[PDB]
Design a protein around this ligand. Structure first.
Ligand SMILES: C=C1/C(=C\C=C2/CCC[C@@]3(C)[C@H]2CCCC[C@H]3[C@H](C)CCCC(C)(C)O)C[C@@H](O)C[C@@H]1O
Ligand SMILES: C=C1/C(=C\C=C2/CCC[C@@]3(C)[C@H]2CCCC[C@H]3[C@H](C)CCCC(C)(C)O)C[C@@H](O)C[C@@H]1O
Lengths: 10, 237, 237, 10
């Protein structure tokens, strides 16, 4: 859940 | 006089914004173009989606934000994303036009373009009135930047868990803003009050956007037009 | 001679394709532009996503497809989407170039562009070799169209539930294709065999794409670049 | 599940 937001936050 | 700790907070918050805001708007040729059905929706979804990436790059540079849990960071960004975008967009808003003027004919976003993205006048009316109130405040960059980080660090967000720690960060930042206005902005006897007033404004605009986005993302031929970032930041999960 | 029922099947399948394929490629200015990191990924995701919408518009016009359950329609489209795209793309492939030539400099997709979308040579090698085998077959439109609907109507797909009924449709369509070649294509003694051979080719290319898309959609900075349609058609749910 | 694909298929 929230794969992208986790990625963008390093 | 300002303390070392408070000018450091100003220094890195101004640089973060300089690293995540482009006054030329050049990256806009990489979006899906504008059309003037909801003709403007693809170009504006791309725009919002790009801006979400810049807000994240800002937040990771606010002191204290990087040390919150990933949950609270997600929780803060989901709730405050649209507001930070409405704040940052002020740099492009011109009173002569009443449009965001991000370029020439194509990237000048009038009010008739916001509707062509699927938003009714219930959002547009207090939004532009917010944009001219923010514009008349003639904020210094230190205050525009500080106000953004203060908006992002509200514990008044759904999902936040460590509201005590993020409240401490938000207060470290209001101290900087109050000190900065008091000692470095002439004629700003009233400014901090009006600025905090604008945070209440945003919460109202936020609700109005969410109501209209919720209605939009429930029609699959429109959510089709959104980017995955947009869907992930503005959905509920 | 061809029966009424079989020329009707040809008539509406040719019109469906004429209604869902644009030989000018004009809608391509509405995509995110190409760049030559994975620079080509946004433009090609948009392209694929637009093409998925056209394939759906084709399928809803194949006789018998509209009467399947919505599940079997979804099941057929998810499995066969990429293959119908590889087939339809043949209309743009030129042997003089070895590129899909959908316009001028920008929309001429070379092989170095497919890689810039994140695909390795394991997909590209049998893909172009497929594209020159399909091109050398000099198919009539009736056969190109028929082959697409036959590919879409394979019961050999994961998820299909009424494989008996869709097998009946696929066989009604091979009868038309065999009859059509036998009576209306001179010098096509061998063509049906070679055409069916190409369906086995596609299944192999399909597997190779899925392996490379799966690896791509598990890296969020790349799935970020996909459209929601793409994510919905190529994901597993 | 498959909100869009269902929509595009009328
Ligand atoms: C975003 C920025 C700039 C302008 C911002 C504007 C003006 C155009 C309209 C929007 C995008 C607005 C920002 C917020 C108000 C409304 C916007 C849409 C109507 C909301 C659609 C979002 C959806 C479809 C997911 O519901 C330009 C530059 O200043 C950089 C800055 O970051
Ligand atoms: C799509 C069409 C046309 C060309 C089709 C091409 C040439 C360019 C490359 C692709 C798109 C290829 C079709 C299939 C082979 C590979 C393609 C990408 C590399 C796969 C990316 C998909 C992802 C990112 C989700 O994994 C043009 C016109 O003939 C209309 C037709 O419908």
């Amino acid at each position: 859940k929230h794969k992208i937001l986790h990625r963008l936050l390093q | 006089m300002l303390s070392d700790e408070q000018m450091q907070i100003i220094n890195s918050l101004v640089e973060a914004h300089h690293k995540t805001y482009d006054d030329s708007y050049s990256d806009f040729v990489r979006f899906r173009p504008p059309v003037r059905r909801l003709s403007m929706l693809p170009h504006l979804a791309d725009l919002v989606s790009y801006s979400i990436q810049k807000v994240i790059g800002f937040a990771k540079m606010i002191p204290g934000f990087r040390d919150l849990t990933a949950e609270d960071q997600i929780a803060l960004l989901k709730s405050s994303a649209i507001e930070i975008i409405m704040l940052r967009s002020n740099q492009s808003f011109s009173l002569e036009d009443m449009s965001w003027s991000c370029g020439g004919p194509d990237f000048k976003y009038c009010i008739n373009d916001v509707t062509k993205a699927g938003h009714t006048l219930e959002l547009l009316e207090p939004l532009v009135k917010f944009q001219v109130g923010l514009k008349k405040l003639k904020l210094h960059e230190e205050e525009h930047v500080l106000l953004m980080a203060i908006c992002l660090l509200s514990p008044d967000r759904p999902g936040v868990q460590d509201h005590v720690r993020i409240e401490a960060l938000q207060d470290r930042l209001c101290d900087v803003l109050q000190a900065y206005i008091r000692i470095q902005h002439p004629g700003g006897r009233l400014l901090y009050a009006k600025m905090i007033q604008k945070l209440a404004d945003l919460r109202s605009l936020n609700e109005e956007h969410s109501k209209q986005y919720r209605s939009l993302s429930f029609q699959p031929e429109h959510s089709m037009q959104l980017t995955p970032l947009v869907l992930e930041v503005f959905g509920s999960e």
